[model samples]
Target: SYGFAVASVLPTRGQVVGVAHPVVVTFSAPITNPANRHAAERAVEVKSTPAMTGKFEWLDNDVVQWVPDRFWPAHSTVELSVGSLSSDFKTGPAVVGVASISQHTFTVSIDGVEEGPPRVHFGEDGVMPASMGRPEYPTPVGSYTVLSKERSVIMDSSGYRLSVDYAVRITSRGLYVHSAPWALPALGLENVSHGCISLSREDAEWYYNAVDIGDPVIVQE
Candidate 1:
């Protein structure tokens, strides 16, 4: 009898993660063949307490991701179980014996503020000077989430290094709405920033405090 194993699972066993977290499993070795592949797919099972429907999708021969139809309900529990045995995995040539059946558990936590309609708009706002990025590094236009916020952070790049304050991260990219005291003169007059939305200290503070992680940020053209 041969021995095969599962490498790991995402969301980690017995860990608490965001509501949007997906379940991912990677086998120690690649799985091949119709019978083995079918067996492997069948070997993995998931169940959500309070009842939630999700399906498994193969990212590749050795990796699978289980995504819920919708964001998981806050404060819920999920369980994953993997069967053992080469027949259970059915990869390579023959049935590899597994040490034992594997099981994992996870908890989901609240993503962000649950109440109130939170909105951050970047661009024209009546008399307020419109905010924009520089020509060479134009701000990306689209809807994004407020990943996080910080009291102050050092925004440095190739040739620029500056300490920014009251920053709200709006994208995975380096774009942020932060206090740019130095750019106050050009705040409303024109766009002159690397890519971040520049604002006065006071306004930046308001934004930092008002916005919550997971809040929606809309950047228009």
Candidate 2:
């Protein structure tokens, strides 16, 4: 019954999202007319407490999404308007996870403050080592967004399968930071995973709790 107007919007109103959250709107009908499409873009307006620059990009004839040119400033107050519809949401504290292939380290930071510990263990009951990808299947070095999290889930790829726990998904392309108890001995010693970052059970659980949808994950060399 929304007709040619907005059918739905993502991250709904009053949401406290991550720095990478995208503002998405789906129209009730296809907006294929060039003039109408341009108008639709203009009809949607975004303002922030500390203004940032970006624009909407059409995902389809009836859907458009907007993401900041850079990640949204942490804890930003975002105001959005879609034609006659209006809503607002905030960005949560900046939490970022960075993994390095050359250094074999996974560092977590909140607002520029590093979490976890040195390349070694964090403490007696602290985080342990991590395993990245191997040569045949190297982890892609790039900036990714946290898409989802799982306390327990079934992970299957190729002929390998297992019930993994405390997993965080960083991409739709099957990349995850999950628990792999069996990889304990190899963690930090060698890059032996199929591409995903593998952490011990205790460490995985901690990481799972540390992130939210749209948080940034950087994999580097």
Candidate 3:
């Protein structure tokens, strides 16, 4: 159980969710901030859908996720943002390497998947150690169904008004995609999230409108 969780970041599939399932964002490490605090708690959210109030809590420094109180509307999408982070460490306002989620193309059908193998993105035998910058907790991968939706108009800690749509509890725990106030890098290609797939503000809005609850995610390389 004490091993690396994410050797590499897995991209989000282009699959959209319907009104039956929530989008889960699982982290492959113990996410932390400059102060070594919960990373997701400082940054992460869903946007546009106000039917569900989504919030993020740190399960651990290497593992933090998000979820809403209810299922999101059918065909809705959310945005995942990491205000600022060094791909190597949670501190700093910039990062190296080209960080990007998978191109949106894959499609997911909520409540349609039964079961499958765990989706591993790094380490030997798909196992990585936490000392490698990634926490040693293998991210949970599989199919789950959305139980319910909530919406929130609260302002995030970053002072950005969060307009969110939550897709009830799914993704093994309280993990769902939502919107938030994001700090953009002047050059782009900087900053990284613990393991949650992220999108540009413009694109995130587009995806948010395209998601539904109970949508299946294919976590792969």
Candidate 4:
């Protein structure tokens, strides 16, 4: 029964760096156990430099990936400990002990240009825009390449500062994190966005200052 490799693990890059993109760990088989995914994810924490604030986005039963809310702070060390994973689809519904930690490391230096600054992942946590009304829908997760960067999408001062405009063309539908002028009161007070994430005037400016054109923005689970 040695036809195809059942279990496999890999780092997304040829090398590891402090600013390395999120380490994607894929399984050949589907995992349904809530504990299994939890265990596999925990393995990395024990060996790596500790993950930042983030969560896993399940692409399907067989595919899962993790991303941080923001890219790892520039030049900070981090790690991914892949637990014992199997390539087989089924494990007989028995307490088939899943996987445990394997380690990877890379130094964080001002490498020739960070492909693009880090991005925020609000795949699952993203809430429905309060203004939309009804059974609000959430944002979908997947790999989205940055389409455009508009400085000051809307020029309004009384609401948001910095003449804010940090729009990423996620789709033709218009979903972005531009400064919320009408949403000034909901700043952290409520999750009232039109299926888009909103940031304060300061965070908007700071994030806008770092990003470049054509960067990759991924939202999973």
Candidate 5:
């Protein structure tokens, strides 16, 4: 068989997701040719309630991600549709045929309010007296939101382990602003963490109590 087509869409039908969620389409087979990729892109369509402008970005030969220019409106519905590959669909050097074709559709609801201003700042160079990650495990520098807060948790990871109190998760990749009592002496003077923003217990607890989920966090280098 020279052609095969199947699409796996993220935020599966009827699922509710955050406003920042991106629509991802993974193809069963790679769409290699530039023209074929364009055709595949055309085959997939996305429509949102209270219309918004968005575009697709190819993550790889077989994966495409669609994201809006701005965060999707809260309380909106997003619809996605894709037509089946045709019998003449090209695969490799030959055109293949499909015995049957099926179209796909999915709907996802966004459930949250638009984010507000930065509620936390991890300053590696300025205001905050906090220690960021060391070179070997560099903390990611970007904008993020406080996903959740925990009064205390066992922060365990490769090689390093700790019982952290007052942790605020800022990234899905495990980065957090948390109490690092052991690193107190180096807090304001050096960057020696394993990618988290290390602060004293008092500061961490204060941050945990003050910040809310979806509140912005700015990490400056």
Candidate 6:
């Protein structure tokens, strides 16, 4: 057997990562001769208390990564094996958001339990008021991975630019949930954003603080 070994694995032992965290194996050596890729593939293993079914995907000759069929069942304890190299990690509490276009509402949840009313109330709706893309631009209904968050970002991708605050990025196509004070009146009443979700200053601030990268934003139209 070749001494092909892993230099490291992501979600390092004892780490607490988000649901989208992939188990990445950085090999000591690249897969130079490509005929039997299975040799490397078969050596890896993944086990979770709740059983997540996924397969390894090659990022390059030297790196292979895997994520569950869906996000690691949210808050799961996982273990990965690259032959002799092994590591384990815990999925932090599932900080997730589900936005309903029909209702113009966004709900936050942790570990499958819906947060019953905002600690920072938006009103009697028991949810945050949100406005998404307008007629010219539609917020695609899908599950988006929370890519990053910024205290403030310049919004220029649309025909104009503005300093948008409390941004939580979902997709790289410039889709974000940010404070749009100008659209405050339309929130929970109409769709009036360029291509992102718009919220009141306080709501945006709360959303930004409630989630971390790799969390999910489920927008349902």
- Number of the top candidate by TM-score? 2
Best by lDDT: 2
After superposing candidate 1 on the true structure, give the runs of residues whose Cα lies further than 4 Å from its correct spot.
Answer: 1-130
Off by over 4 Å in 3: 1-141, 144-172, 180-191
Local lDDT at 16 for model 5: 49
- How many residue pairs clash (N, CA or C atoms closer than 3 angstroms) in each of the candidate models, in the order given? 2, 0, 52, 11, 0, 0
All-Cα superposition RMSD per candidate? 14.4, 3.7, 19.7, 15.4, 14.9, 4.1
Superposed by TM-score, candidate 6 places the C-alpha of residue 48 at a distance from the truth, in angstroms, of: 3.8
| Model 3 RMSD vs true structure | 19.7
Ten contiguous residues with the weakest lDDT in model 6: 117-126
**Global lDDT scores for all candidate models:** 0.53, 0.77, 0.33, 0.39, 0.56, 0.75
| Residue-pair clashes, model 3 | 52
Give the TM-score of each candidate: 0.48, 0.81, 0.29, 0.34, 0.48, 0.75
Better of 1 and 2 by lDDT: 2
lDDT of model number 5: 0.56
**What is the lDDT for 32 in model 3?**
51
Mind giving the per-residue lDDT tens digits that candidate 3 earns over 1-221?
62333333211434443432333444566545635443344443434224356556454556544554554443334333333321211111110111122321112222332211131123222121111001332223443443333455342323233444422233444433333234223112322333333333433343344333443333332
Residue-wise lDDT of candidate 6 within 47-139, one digit each (tens)? 654567777878788888775678776566677655666567877778878888877778877777666334224544437888888888888
- Candidate 2, residues 199-220: lDDT per residue as tens digits? 8777777777777888888899
Error of 2 at 26 (Å): 2.5
| Residue 153 Cα positional deviation in candidate 4, in Å, after optimal superposition | 2.8
Indicate whether candidate 2 or candidate 4 has the larger lDDT: 2
Worst 10 residues of 5 by lDDT: 97-106
Could you give me the TM-score of model 2 versus the true structure? 0.81
